[model samples]
Target: VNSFSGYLKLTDNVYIKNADIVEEAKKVKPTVVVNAANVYLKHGGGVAGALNKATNNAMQVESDDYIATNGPLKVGGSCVLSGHNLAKHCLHVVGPNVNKGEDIQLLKSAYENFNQHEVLLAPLLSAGIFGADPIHSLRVCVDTVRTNVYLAVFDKNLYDKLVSSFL
Candidate 1:
């Protein structure tokens, strides 16, 4: 778990050899992996796959502006307001239960939302978790975004954990 969103410059030539990040990713065959973009297919299956199957954001919206969400309990009529906070598109993830091992699942759904193009990630709030109070949750959100374009907000301590994840 890491979180750091600082933009870095090329000072030294950093090379990674023998790191089979892609090969290692293909080893596991996932039935359905939630994703945020088409890039996931490059590494086989991931959350991106989940995003492919994720329900449409505007589908069946209550009234020209509503959506359906899945919780750990798989209950319907749920939605994450964070989606609207993003830069352009809309993608949200809500959990069925907190301790039901659904946080990751919800995170996966969030990524999938991005994959399906419902979200494109704001340049300043990629993870969309700056508003979260939990350090753990904040970091997790950053990790979920990985090395992306999210920027530093007014509070540095807020995304301390998220800032470290990208590193």
Candidate 2:
């Protein structure tokens, strides 16, 4: 039901769009949607959790199977899940547990791994239940990334706030 009010570029190719993550997913249909997962795909809270549930647990099942086979996911490491959503691919990566005050270096490392795709849709990394400030976390994403980064905001108010900052 939510929609993007507008979009703006914070840094050259890095842009932020105010829209429902799921709705945006259906639109851009990027090659990969990064799941800011924990050691397990705990998509039960925040944007990370919201995405898993929106996809009807398609991502959870994918993450679970990967863990069962490969052991815990490490920072900077990733696994791909495909064929269940609007996007052709889902790239799952374990960023630091933002709640525990986990190392930002690990979070940065995790972000580095997913930059290969041409189009990627990512939410506020570690924001929500993970305790990262959605705004601040995004700044980190823009700072370190080499690839074009597209940011999605579920709340219209937040999206407007981000746009105003850039203005």
Candidate 3:
């Protein structure tokens, strides 16, 4: 794990991980894991696909029914799923796209409204395919959650910056 500062008016408990998300997910045995889902719960690529794969397609099979009943999720909109994937429960959310003006606001909104848990594992959602900065996204989730945020970092540059920022 790495370090980071600049807490946003909260007791920050963010940790940086330079490990496989699946491997980290196994050890934490987290109560919840946040998923950066698309507007309609479409899981084709990016972290969405990775999450589905981790969960053994449990989420993918369930998503269609979820979308039919709930409709499209606006920016920062979300839902919950129970079962074994990365955690006991999954908090699926639709976040801001890359370079979008509302990226930070929407990402913060996603974290702000998440269900409480003593341990929550949320990867760098929207930071990869969506083109947002992983470190910034990490900060937002940490500030909004206020505690119990474990961010998995696969990107070496992201891992370095997070460590350097705190050092």
Q: Which candidate comes out best when scored by TM-score?
A: 2
Could you tell me every candidate's TM-score relative to the true structure? 0.31, 0.83, 0.80
Candidate 1 clashes: the total is 28
Residue 135 in candidate 3, Cα distance off native in Å = 3.2
Q: Give lDDT tens digits, candidate 3, residues 42-96.
A: 8787777887887788888888888888787788877887636567887787778
Residue 59 displacement (Å), model 3: 1.2
Model 2, 7-120: lDDT tens digits are: 566787577877666777777667777677776665677666777777788877876787788787665577777726757787777766667878766767777765777667
21-50: candidate 1 lDDT, tens digit per residue: 122123322111112221111112222222
Evaluate all candidate structures by whole-model CA lDDT and list the values in order: 0.27, 0.70, 0.69
Ranking by lDDT: 2, 3, 1
Off by over 4 Å in 1: 1-88, 95-103, 122-155
lDDT of 1: 0.27
CA RMSD (A), model 2: 3.7
CA deviation > 4 Å runs, candidate 2: 1-6
